[PDB]
DNA sequence: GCTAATACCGGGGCCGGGAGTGGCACACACCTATATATATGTGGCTGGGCCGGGCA
């Protein structure tokens, strides 16, 4: 289908331009449509200061959007859970525009050393 | 002159937190044991002679 080609695209871009934990979180969202913050912490066994910059990096690239869902279950605790969701069109647009900017920025450097 | 729908304020009940307390993990210095030369520098303890108090 067309939806799976977007998944392979995100795997190629995140795997190709970032480290491993980025595709760890990425695949962790590709397996579960709504991934809680406590599930990703207990999954990769990473600290909060290590889960922070990863989610912030995946949000700065417009790859995923977050959904802070409310909770008032058992102990009447307002348990908020940041459920991550893959933003397909904004991520594809980010990939296309970033590729265009890479081509344009690598084309300008050739004209300077030509003379 | 008369009546029903609308909006503002207060009280009792309910939820999040962060400095406090406590717990867990990792890394680095101490200092006990022993050795010689050296000496001022006391700190502390003990025996003999002298004096004052108790006793015959």
């Amino acid at each position: 289908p067309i939806d799976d080609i977007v998944k392979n695209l995100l795997k190629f871009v995140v795997r190709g331009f970032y480290g491993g934990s980025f595709v760890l979180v990425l695949d962790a969202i590709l397996f579960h449509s709504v991934l809680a913050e406590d599930d990703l912490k207990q999954l990769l066994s990473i600290n909060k200061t290590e889960l922070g910059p990863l989610i912030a990096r995946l949000r700065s690239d417009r790859l995923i959007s977050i959904h802070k869902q409310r909770e008032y279950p058992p102990n009447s605790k307002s348990v908020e859970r940041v459920y991550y969701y893959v933003k397909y069109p904004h991520a594809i647009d980010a990939i296309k525009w970033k590729v265009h900017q890479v081509v344009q920025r690598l084309k300008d450097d050739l004209d300077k050393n030509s003379e």
Side-chain angles (χ1 to χ4, degrees), chain A residues 1-62 73-74 87-115:
Chain A
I2 309 299
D3 303 329
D4 298 331
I5 309 180
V6 183
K7 300 180 180 60
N8 299 123
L9 175 68
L10 298 177
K11 292 178 180 299
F12 293 157
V13 171
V14 173
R15 268 157 43 189
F17 296 98
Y18 295 96
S21 56
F22 299 90
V23 81
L24 266 42
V25 179
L26 177 66
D27 297 330
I29 310 168
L30 293 180
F31 291 162
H32 300 274
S33 61
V34 281
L35 177 65
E37 183 176 328
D38 300 332
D39 300 331
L40 185 61
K41 191 265 180 300
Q42 299 295 334
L43 177 60
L44 302 180
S45 300
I46 59 180
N47 305 15
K48 307 299 297 180
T49 60
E50 298 178 330
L51 190 143
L54 299 180
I55 301 301
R57 181 61 60 180
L58 297 182
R59 290 176 300 180
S60 60
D61 303 321
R62 300 185 61 177
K87 197 56 176 296
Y88 307 94
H90 292 181
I92 297 176
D93 294 331
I95 296 166
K96 296 182 298 180
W97 203 78
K98 280 181 179 181
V99 167
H100 179 266
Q101 289 297 328
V102 167
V103 175
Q104 291 295 144
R105 285 180 180 180
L106 290 184
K107 185 60 180 180
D108 298 324
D109 300 331
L110 183 63
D111 301 321
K112 182 180 61 180
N113 299 121
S114 300
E115 180 67 25

